[PDB]
């Protein structure tokens, strides 16, 4: 098996080009507003035609690049790829070092991970230097709409969890674990919605609300990028759920307990709950679709958010270089 375990490996010279172009494409004003990207936040990756090759060989391409443990688990619980009316989303392999939130979000749109930690360091130097009043208010809203048990002190704790350097090594892990309020900020910095596709099946073992839409609510509307970053969270792990290149969209509903349930939208005040439908479309490109309903025979109508088109130029797109790699390796596959 001569196929690399990841995408960015295929051309590490291009991967490094990307890494180098990443903090360059980050805009930095200094007047109390959060940091963000210039152009690269608009990028988006899309996995390639894997069904074009022979099945003896598709396995080789799959097992290397796709997180079969998480793709299975999400699929197996009617949360991944459940809608026959829409294209398939595949989970890519991220380094699960407690910075895999970022490894995924960068993977979703560059092909590289957060290996130089520009994003992690972005998040870390955001919380600190910029005004974070809006962000705290939201966080201490979800927080006492849950738990019930000192919230003033727990904030400075969340930012040092977002430390650039190694914390107390959890399981010998590299970096400290991230959570819901972190995903909100990263949406804002990227000025781009994030949709997490979370595990719902935890029944036997001796209770999180991570999944859902994360919107750039610190930032105003359609001026932002209104095409989602889609991520999968299964165990303790983030994978980019990258679409490919039906029409492309992600469902805004959940097939659970025999009902179409809306996806949670995070950190929302009472006024924004009434805008919630109108808060999307402004921030996504919502479009109704006759999905097959609860069998018997009733096309049930629900909404979904169309995804973005693969727009990385071959100057900074890695998948295209992988694709060449698998082609030549298949060309030998047909020699013998």
Swiss-Prot record:
Subcellular location as annotated: Cytoplasm; Nucleus; Lysosome
Residues annotated as catalytic: 97, 100, 237
Region (Interaction with ubiquitin) location: 177-179
Annotated spans, TRAF-binding: 55-277
Record-annotated membrane-spanning stretches: none
Effect ascribed to mutating residue 97 to A: Loss of deubiquitinating activity
Inducing or repressing factors: By cytokines. TNF-alpha may regulate expression in the thymus. Up-regulated in presence of reactive oxygen species (ROS), like H(2)O(2), in LPS-tolerized macrophages.
Domain spans labelled OTU: 89-244
Tissue: Found in most tissues during development. Strikingly high levels are found in lymphoid organs, including the thymus, spleen, and gut-associated lymphoid tissue. Constitutively expressed in immature and mature thymocyte subpopulations as well as in resting peripheral T-cells; activation of these leads to down-regulation.
Similarity section: Belongs to the peptidase C64 family.
Cited function: Ubiquitin-editing enzyme that contains both ubiquitin ligase and deubiquitinase activities. Involved in immune and inflammatory responses signaled by cytokines, such as TNF-alpha and IL-1 beta, or pathogens via Toll-like receptors (TLRs) through terminating NF-kappa-B activity. Essential component of a ubiquitin-editing protein complex, comprising also RNF11, ITCH and TAX1BP1, that ensures the transient nature of inflammatory signaling pathways.
Record note on domains: The A20-type zinc fingers mediate the ubiquitin ligase activity. The A20-type zinc finger 4 selectively recognizes 'Lys-63'-linked polyubiquitin. The A20-type zinc finger 4-7 are sufficient to bind polyubiquitin. The OTU domain mediates the deubiquitinase activity.
Subunit organization: Homodimer. Interacts with TNIP1, TAX1BP1 and TRAF2. Interacts with RNF11, ITCH and TAX1BP1 only after TNF stimulation; these interaction are transient and they are lost after 1 hour of stimulation with TNF. Interacts with YWHAZ and YWHAH. Interacts with IKBKG; the interaction is induced by TNF stimulation and by polyubiquitin. Interacts with RIPK1. Interacts with UBE2N; the interaction requires TAX1BP1. Interacts with TRAF6.
Name of the protein: Tumor necrosis factor alpha-induced protein 3
Source lineage: Eukaryota, Metazoa, Chordata, Craniata, Vertebrata
